[PDB]
Design a protein around this ligand. Structure first.
Ligand SMILES: [Zn+2]
Length: 184
């Protein structure tokens, strides 16, 4: 199983590189890796398991975070009471279209690759449409909004060597952009 010791931290060169496109079909190893990435999220969200292995809870993970420069991500967002949940392992995910209007989490964002918290709003697109392949090479096209849209953009950013704090304004980190959607 993957644990915190597999998660590389801010400063590691791989986090700033541009992950390489995956050739389909994925190799056996690449599939096992993607499955392990999702499994890590599962474990991180289980109170008992996370405690036992000292895992930091999270809803997204990108291959670069475990030092694998490949364009693969895993997103595991639990039911928000709305009945909506997101359990996706994506290969070569790409935002094909998006809203002009932005959105942001009121408390900012966090990342397992960044040990300490960083204050500041991270404005992203409120709505996005992503096209990707799934673990078996089949086609997936997602229409996301709000929180999940923010999570996927955060993960895709990892594939381009972009960290969440790159989006935080230095002078006015907590000042919301006019007309931006505060995601509750
Ligand atoms: Zn992250």
């Amino acid at each position: 199983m993957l644990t915190m010791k597999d998660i590389i931290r801010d400063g590691h060169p791989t986090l700033r590189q541009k992950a390489a496109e995956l050739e389909l079909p994925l190799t056996k190893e690449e599939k096992e890796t993607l499955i392990a990435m999702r499994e890590f999220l599962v474990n991180s969200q289980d109170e008992e398991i996370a405690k036992r292995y000292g895992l930091r809870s999270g809803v997204g993970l990108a291959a670069p975070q475990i030092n694998i420069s490949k364009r693969m991500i895993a997103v595991l967002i639990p039911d928000d009471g709305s009945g909506k949940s997101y359990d996706y392992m994506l290969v070569n995910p790409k935002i094909v279209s998006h809203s002009v209007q932005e959105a942001y989490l009121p408390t900012g964002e966090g990342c397992l690759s960044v040990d300490d918290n960083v204050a500041g709003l991270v404005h992203r697109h409120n709505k996005i449409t992503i096209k990707a392949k799934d673990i078996e090479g089949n086609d997936i096209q997602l229409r996301l909004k709000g929180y999940p849209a923010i999570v996927f953009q955060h993960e895709i950013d990892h594939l381009n060597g972009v960290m969440f704090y790159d989006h935080i304004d230095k002078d006015h980190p907590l000042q919301p952009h006019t007309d931006a959607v505060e995601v509750h």
